[PDB]
mmCIF file of N, CA and C in Angstrom:
data_model
loop_
_atom_site.group_PDB
_atom_site.id
_atom_site.type_symbol
_atom_site.label_atom_id
_atom_site.label_comp_id
_atom_site.label_asym_id
_atom_site.label_seq_id
_atom_site.Cartn_x
_atom_site.Cartn_y
_atom_site.Cartn_z
ATOM 1 N N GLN A 253 88.744 100.909 109.600
ATOM 2 C CA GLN A 253 87.728 100.568 110.885
ATOM 3 C C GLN A 253 87.226 99.055 110.320
ATOM 4 N N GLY A 254 86.911 98.839 109.085
ATOM 5 C CA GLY A 254 86.269 97.662 108.813
ATOM 6 C C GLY A 254 87.309 96.392 109.100
ATOM 7 N N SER A 255 88.381 96.679 109.263
ATOM 8 C CA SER A 255 89.615 95.638 109.726
ATOM 9 C C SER A 255 90.208 95.979 110.925
ATOM 10 N N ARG A 256 89.354 96.081 111.858
ATOM 11 C CA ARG A 256 89.847 96.575 113.206
ATOM 12 C C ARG A 256 89.523 95.296 114.235
ATOM 13 N N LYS A 257 90.478 94.810 114.792
ATOM 14 C CA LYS A 257 90.460 93.594 115.305
ATOM 15 C C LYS A 257 90.229 94.291 117.004
ATOM 16 N N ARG A 258 89.189 94.428 117.633
ATOM 17 C CA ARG A 258 88.658 95.030 118.680
ATOM 18 C C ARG A 258 89.083 93.981 119.849
ATOM 19 N N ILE A 259 89.741 94.290 121.105
ATOM 20 C CA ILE A 259 90.172 93.568 122.139
ATOM 21 C C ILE A 259 89.885 94.162 123.284
ATOM 22 N N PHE A 260 89.222 93.808 124.417
ATOM 23 C CA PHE A 260 89.042 94.141 125.626
ATOM 24 C C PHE A 260 89.307 93.635 126.676
ATOM 25 N N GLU A 261 89.245 94.024 128.002
ATOM 26 C CA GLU A 261 89.903 93.922 129.275
ATOM 27 C C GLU A 261 88.712 93.657 130.417
ATOM 28 N N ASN A 262 88.185 92.397 130.499
ATOM 29 C CA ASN A 262 87.253 92.365 131.504
ATOM 30 C C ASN A 262 87.759 92.132 132.915
ATOM 31 N N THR A 263 87.306 92.933 133.862
ATOM 32 C CA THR A 263 87.604 92.931 135.265
ATOM 33 C C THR A 263 86.739 92.929 136.517
ATOM 34 N N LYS A 264 85.512 92.153 136.020
ATOM 35 C CA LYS A 264 84.208 91.931 136.767
ATOM 36 C C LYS A 264 83.591 92.993 137.393
ATOM 37 N N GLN A 265 84.019 94.526 137.097
ATOM 38 C CA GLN A 265 83.328 95.462 137.123
ATOM 39 C C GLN A 265 83.457 96.652 136.053
ATOM 40 N N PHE A 266 84.181 96.410 135.116
ATOM 41 C CA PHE A 266 84.367 97.437 133.763
ATOM 42 C C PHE A 266 84.738 96.516 132.669
ATOM 43 N N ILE A 267 84.731 96.745 131.479
ATOM 44 C CA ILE A 267 85.282 96.199 130.132
ATOM 45 C C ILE A 267 86.246 97.165 129.620
ATOM 46 N N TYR A 268 87.230 97.285 129.768
ATOM 47 C CA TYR A 268 88.215 98.372 129.227
ATOM 48 C C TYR A 268 88.709 97.698 127.890
ATOM 49 N N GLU A 269 88.107 98.606 126.625
ATOM 50 C CA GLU A 269 88.650 98.286 125.541
ATOM 51 C C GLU A 269 90.302 98.738 125.471
ATOM 52 N N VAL A 270 91.094 98.071 124.600
ATOM 53 C CA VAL A 270 92.160 98.303 124.533
ATOM 54 C C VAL A 270 92.617 99.201 122.999
ATOM 55 N N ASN A 271 93.618 100.129 123.030
ATOM 56 C CA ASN A 271 94.009 100.651 121.876
ATOM 57 C C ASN A 271 94.772 99.880 121.245
ATOM 58 N N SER A 272 94.518 99.067 120.201
ATOM 59 C CA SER A 272 94.951 98.178 119.535
ATOM 60 C C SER A 272 94.813 98.067 118.158
ATOM 61 N N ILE A 273 95.746 97.853 117.325
ATOM 62 C CA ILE A 273 95.928 97.900 115.798
ATOM 63 C C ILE A 273 96.148 96.788 115.024
ATOM 64 N N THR A 274 95.638 96.126 114.163
ATOM 65 C CA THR A 274 96.003 95.059 113.288
ATOM 66 C C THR A 274 96.295 95.214 111.995
ATOM 67 N N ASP A 275 97.463 94.611 111.377
ATOM 68 C CA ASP A 275 97.916 94.552 110.344
ATOM 69 C C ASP A 275 96.706 93.483 109.218
ATOM 70 N N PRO A 276 97.072 93.630 107.919
ATOM 71 C CA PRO A 276 96.348 92.771 106.847
ATOM 72 C C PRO A 276 96.272 91.343 107.318
ATOM 73 N N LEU A 277 97.416 90.675 107.984
ATOM 74 C CA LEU A 277 97.852 89.429 108.438
ATOM 75 C C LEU A 277 96.590 88.986 109.706
ATOM 76 N N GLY A 278 96.340 89.965 110.368
ATOM 77 C CA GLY A 278 95.451 89.737 111.565
ATOM 78 C C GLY A 278 96.341 89.520 113.115
ATOM 79 N N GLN A 279 98.077 90.277 112.657
ATOM 80 C CA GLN A 279 98.736 90.204 113.938
ATOM 81 C C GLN A 279 98.002 91.676 114.442
ATOM 82 N N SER A 280 97.540 91.361 115.743
ATOM 83 C CA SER A 280 97.336 92.514 116.588
ATOM 84 C C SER A 280 98.285 93.410 117.505
ATOM 85 N N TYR A 281 98.263 94.448 117.342
ATOM 86 C CA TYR A 281 99.436 95.238 117.989
ATOM 87 C C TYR A 281 98.572 96.368 118.845
ATOM 88 N N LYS A 282 99.416 96.223 120.278
ATOM 89 C CA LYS A 282 98.927 97.247 121.116
ATOM 90 C C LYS A 282 99.729 98.477 121.171
ATOM 91 N N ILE A 283 99.010 99.566 121.340
ATOM 92 C CA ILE A 283 99.769 100.997 121.074
ATOM 93 C C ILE A 283 99.804 101.581 122.617
ATOM 94 N N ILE A 284 100.948 101.524 122.951
ATOM 95 C CA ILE A 284 101.247 102.652 124.032
ATOM 96 C C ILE A 284 102.409 103.730 123.892
ATOM 97 N N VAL A 285 102.276 104.708 124.608
ATOM 98 C CA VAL A 285 103.204 105.894 124.183
ATOM 99 C C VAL A 285 103.844 106.016 125.715
ATOM 100 N N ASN A 286 105.339 106.691 125.391
ATOM 101 C CA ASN A 286 106.077 107.083 126.373
ATOM 102 C C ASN A 286 106.667 108.304 126.225
ATOM 103 N N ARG A 287 106.989 109.110 127.263
ATOM 104 C CA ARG A 287 107.495 110.658 127.116
ATOM 105 C C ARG A 287 108.961 110.363 127.010
ATOM 106 N N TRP A 288 109.523 109.442 127.159
ATOM 107 C CA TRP A 288 111.003 109.165 126.896
ATOM 108 C C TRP A 288 111.522 108.639 125.705
ATOM 109 N N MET A 289 111.001 108.745 124.714
ATOM 110 C CA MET A 289 111.151 108.278 123.588
ATOM 111 C C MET A 289 112.054 109.450 122.523
ATOM 112 N N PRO A 290 112.709 108.843 121.630
ATOM 113 C CA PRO A 290 113.752 109.606 121.075
ATOM 114 C C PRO A 290 112.862 110.563 120.214
ATOM 115 N N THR A 291 111.721 110.429 120.029
ATOM 116 C CA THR A 291 110.628 110.995 119.184
ATOM 117 C C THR A 291 111.036 111.275 117.554
ATOM 118 N N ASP A 292 112.110 110.436 116.825
ATOM 119 C CA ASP A 292 112.394 110.290 115.675
ATOM 120 C C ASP A 292 112.629 108.843 115.152
ATOM 121 N N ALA A 293 111.703 107.748 115.990
ATOM 122 C CA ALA A 293 111.913 106.242 115.719
ATOM 123 C C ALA A 293 110.236 105.745 116.614
ATOM 124 N N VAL A 294 109.927 104.607 115.753
ATOM 125 C CA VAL A 294 109.231 103.734 116.584
ATOM 126 C C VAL A 294 109.667 102.627 116.729
ATOM 127 N N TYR A 295 109.187 101.682 117.581
ATOM 128 C CA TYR A 295 109.654 100.581 118.216
ATOM 129 C C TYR A 295 108.560 99.338 118.184
ATOM 130 N N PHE A 296 109.020 98.156 117.660
ATOM 131 C CA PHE A 296 107.912 96.940 117.571
ATOM 132 C C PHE A 296 108.680 95.801 118.516
ATOM 133 N N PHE A 297 107.932 95.232 119.611
ATOM 134 C CA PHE A 297 108.563 94.151 120.439
ATOM 135 C C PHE A 297 107.497 93.370 120.918
ATOM 136 N N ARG A 298 107.959 92.105 121.991
ATOM 137 C CA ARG A 298 107.085 91.468 122.486
ATOM 138 C C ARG A 298 106.960 91.765 124.017
ATOM 139 N N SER A 299 107.926 92.675 124.604
ATOM 140 C CA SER A 299 108.226 93.105 125.825
ATOM 141 C C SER A 299 108.647 91.805 126.976
ATOM 142 N N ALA A 300 108.844 90.496 126.128
ATOM 143 C CA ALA A 300 108.903 89.275 126.949
ATOM 144 C C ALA A 300 110.503 88.973 126.228
ATOM 145 N N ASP A 301 110.821 88.971 125.152
ATOM 146 C CA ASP A 301 112.262 88.876 124.720
ATOM 147 C C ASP A 301 113.428 89.530 125.311
ATOM 148 N N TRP A 302 113.008 90.563 125.837
ATOM 149 C CA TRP A 302 114.419 91.735 126.638
ATOM 150 C C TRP A 302 114.427 91.086 128.170
ATOM 151 N N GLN O 253 81.638 95.616 105.946
ATOM 152 C CA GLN O 253 81.521 95.942 107.386
ATOM 153 C C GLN O 253 80.273 95.772 108.320
ATOM 154 N N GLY O 254 79.234 95.933 107.944
ATOM 155 C CA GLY O 254 77.915 96.033 108.686
ATOM 156 C C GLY O 254 77.568 94.622 108.795
ATOM 157 N N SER O 255 78.060 94.011 107.866
ATOM 158 C CA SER O 255 77.551 92.399 107.999
ATOM 159 C C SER O 255 78.435 91.436 108.666
ATOM 160 N N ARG O 256 79.741 91.761 108.864
ATOM 161 C CA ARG O 256 80.480 91.065 109.310
ATOM 162 C C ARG O 256 80.157 90.452 110.924
ATOM 163 N N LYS O 257 80.248 89.221 111.240
ATOM 164 C CA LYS O 257 80.134 88.787 112.407
ATOM 165 C C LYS O 257 81.194 88.325 113.147
ATOM 166 N N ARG O 258 81.485 89.620 114.056
ATOM 167 C CA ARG O 258 82.708 89.650 114.807
ATOM 168 C C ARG O 258 82.326 88.614 115.924
ATOM 169 N N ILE O 259 83.329 87.721 115.987
ATOM 170 C CA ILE O 259 83.536 86.857 117.351
ATOM 171 C C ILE O 259 84.631 87.039 117.816
ATOM 172 N N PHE O 260 84.535 86.558 119.077
ATOM 173 C CA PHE O 260 85.691 86.791 120.344
ATOM 174 C C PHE O 260 85.944 85.489 121.039
ATOM 175 N N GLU O 261 86.875 85.682 121.755
ATOM 176 C CA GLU O 261 87.310 84.549 122.428
ATOM 177 C C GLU O 261 87.706 85.256 123.866
ATOM 178 N N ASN O 262 87.095 84.562 124.769
ATOM 179 C CA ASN O 262 87.310 84.986 126.152
ATOM 180 C C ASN O 262 88.553 84.243 126.877
ATOM 181 N N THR O 263 89.287 84.920 127.680
ATOM 182 C CA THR O 263 90.515 84.221 128.305
ATOM 183 C C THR O 263 90.472 84.437 129.729
ATOM 184 N N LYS O 264 89.553 85.001 130.639
ATOM 185 C CA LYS O 264 89.613 85.292 131.782
ATOM 186 C C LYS O 264 90.002 86.506 132.011
ATOM 187 N N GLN O 265 90.891 87.167 131.236
ATOM 188 C CA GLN O 265 91.712 88.134 131.341
ATOM 189 C C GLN O 265 91.625 89.336 130.313
ATOM 190 N N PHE O 266 91.238 88.880 128.846
ATOM 191 C CA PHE O 266 91.159 89.715 127.813
ATOM 192 C C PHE O 266 90.328 88.906 126.958
ATOM 193 N N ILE O 267 89.671 89.921 125.886
ATOM 194 C CA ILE O 267 88.776 89.146 124.919
ATOM 195 C C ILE O 267 89.259 89.520 123.576
ATOM 196 N N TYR O 268 90.169 88.591 122.904
ATOM 197 C CA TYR O 268 90.584 88.546 121.625
ATOM 198 C C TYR O 268 89.705 88.447 120.533
ATOM 199 N N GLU O 269 89.381 89.368 119.935
ATOM 200 C CA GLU O 269 88.459 89.194 118.636
ATOM 201 C C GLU O 269 89.152 88.432 117.312
ATOM 202 N N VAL O 270 88.565 87.657 116.633
ATOM 203 C CA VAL O 270 89.232 86.861 115.572
ATOM 204 C C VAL O 270 88.952 87.203 114.366
ATOM 205 N N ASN O 271 89.961 87.271 113.412
ATOM 206 C CA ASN O 271 89.824 87.915 112.331
ATOM 207 C C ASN O 271 88.926 86.882 111.307
ATOM 208 N N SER O 272 87.593 87.151 111.385
ATOM 209 C CA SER O 272 86.668 86.059 110.644
ATOM 210 C C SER O 272 86.043 86.947 109.722
ATOM 211 N N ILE O 273 86.091 86.194 108.567
ATOM 212 C CA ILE O 273 85.190 86.766 107.296
ATOM 213 C C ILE O 273 83.868 86.030 107.247
ATOM 214 N N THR O 274 82.766 86.672 107.197
ATOM 215 C CA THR O 274 81.302 86.055 106.722
ATOM 216 C C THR O 274 81.143 86.085 105.250
ATOM 217 N N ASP O 275 80.183 85.212 105.032
ATOM 218 C CA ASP O 275 79.641 84.999 103.672
ATOM 219 C C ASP O 275 78.108 85.677 103.551
ATOM 220 N N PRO O 276 77.585 86.417 102.492
ATOM 221 C CA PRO O 276 76.144 86.448 102.603
ATOM 222 C C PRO O 276 75.250 85.198 102.925
ATOM 223 N N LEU O 277 75.718 84.177 103.193
ATOM 224 C CA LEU O 277 74.782 83.153 103.424
ATOM 225 C C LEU O 277 74.622 83.086 104.953
ATOM 226 N N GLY O 278 75.463 83.835 105.696
ATOM 227 C CA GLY O 278 75.397 83.812 107.080
ATOM 228 C C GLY O 278 76.518 83.365 107.700
ATOM 229 N N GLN O 279 77.361 82.196 106.992
ATOM 230 C CA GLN O 279 78.531 81.353 107.501
ATOM 231 C C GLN O 279 79.937 82.197 107.547
ATOM 232 N N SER O 280 80.394 81.919 108.869
ATOM 233 C CA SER O 280 81.820 82.647 109.017
ATOM 234 C C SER O 280 82.938 81.758 108.942
ATOM 235 N N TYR O 281 83.958 82.493 108.651
ATOM 236 C CA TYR O 281 85.241 81.583 108.469
ATOM 237 C C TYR O 281 86.580 82.418 108.811
ATOM 238 N N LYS O 282 87.294 81.625 109.689
ATOM 239 C CA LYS O 282 88.434 82.486 110.039
ATOM 240 C C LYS O 282 89.656 82.399 108.976
ATOM 241 N N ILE O 283 90.695 83.413 109.346
ATOM 242 C CA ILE O 283 91.750 83.851 108.270
ATOM 243 C C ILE O 283 92.855 83.698 108.985
ATOM 244 N N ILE O 284 93.783 82.196 108.738
ATOM 245 C CA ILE O 284 94.915 81.980 109.203
ATOM 246 C C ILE O 284 95.997 82.423 108.189
ATOM 247 N N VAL O 285 97.251 82.827 108.580
ATOM 248 C CA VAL O 285 98.306 82.826 107.356
ATOM 249 C C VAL O 285 99.543 82.105 107.726
ATOM 250 N N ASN O 286 100.187 81.661 106.618
ATOM 251 C CA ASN O 286 100.954 80.751 106.677
ATOM 252 C C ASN O 286 102.030 80.723 105.582
ATOM 253 N N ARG O 287 103.150 80.761 105.758
ATOM 254 C CA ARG O 287 104.649 80.838 104.817
ATOM 255 C C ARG O 287 104.229 79.658 104.225
ATOM 256 N N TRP O 288 103.865 78.246 104.464
ATOM 257 C CA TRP O 288 104.286 77.263 103.744
ATOM 258 C C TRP O 288 102.920 77.082 102.417
ATOM 259 N N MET O 289 102.220 78.207 102.347
ATOM 260 C CA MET O 289 101.207 77.934 101.240
ATOM 261 C C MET O 289 101.869 78.362 99.858
ATOM 262 N N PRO O 290 101.296 77.798 99.069
ATOM 263 C CA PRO O 290 102.405 78.116 97.612
ATOM 264 C C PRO O 290 102.248 79.317 97.205
ATOM 265 N N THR O 291 101.581 80.232 97.737
ATOM 266 C CA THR O 291 101.551 81.774 97.519
ATOM 267 C C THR O 291 100.257 82.080 96.220
ATOM 268 N N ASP O 292 99.924 81.319 95.583
ATOM 269 C CA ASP O 292 98.921 81.136 94.438
ATOM 270 C C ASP O 292 97.513 80.455 94.778
ATOM 271 N N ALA O 293 97.446 80.358 95.647
ATOM 272 C CA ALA O 293 96.063 79.877 95.781
ATOM 273 C C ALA O 293 95.307 79.507 97.495
ATOM 274 N N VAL O 294 94.052 79.564 97.628
ATOM 275 C CA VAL O 294 94.055 79.573 99.086
ATOM 276 C C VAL O 294 93.028 78.127 99.318
ATOM 277 N N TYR O 295 92.730 77.569 100.696
ATOM 278 C CA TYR O 295 92.326 76.499 100.895
ATOM 279 C C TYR O 295 90.780 76.782 101.567
ATOM 280 N N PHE O 296 89.748 76.166 101.565
ATOM 281 C CA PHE O 296 88.567 76.295 102.044
ATOM 282 C C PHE O 296 88.179 75.020 102.876
ATOM 283 N N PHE O 297 88.527 74.823 104.090
ATOM 284 C CA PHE O 297 88.184 73.404 104.774
ATOM 285 C C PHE O 297 87.922 73.625 105.891
ATOM 286 N N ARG O 298 87.829 72.426 107.119
ATOM 287 C CA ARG O 298 87.078 72.600 108.184
ATOM 288 C C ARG O 298 88.420 72.576 109.575
ATOM 289 N N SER O 299 89.290 71.562 109.111
ATOM 290 C CA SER O 299 90.509 71.428 109.823
ATOM 291 C C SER O 299 90.467 70.220 110.570
ATOM 292 N N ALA O 300 89.222 69.610 110.524
ATOM 293 C CA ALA O 300 88.999 68.284 111.303
ATOM 294 C C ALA O 300 88.838 66.972 110.317
ATOM 295 N N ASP O 301 88.469 67.163 109.220
ATOM 296 C CA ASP O 301 88.166 66.480 108.086
ATOM 297 C C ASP O 301 89.519 65.940 107.419
ATOM 298 N N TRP O 302 90.662 66.402 107.753
ATOM 299 C CA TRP O 302 91.900 65.776 107.358
ATOM 300 C C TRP O 302 92.815 65.283 108.388
#
């Protein structure tokens, strides 16, 4: 908790916080879930190099 | 945790919280990581006096 880099999303009508997690280095990570994952592995990427 | 002065950065679409640590004296300090460090010490500076 004490090392949780909060990150929000302003929309002019609501401030939607994001389910993000950060490492000791400060690198923030957003967490999204997909129903078609193989269920026996996790993926880390930027969604732009692909 | 209770004394950590959480500072944020607006970007017109997101609010990225910075990984800043504060001292009991009330001053805040950003935390940046670099592979170029000697790995055995840390530097406290302003980034504008150099």
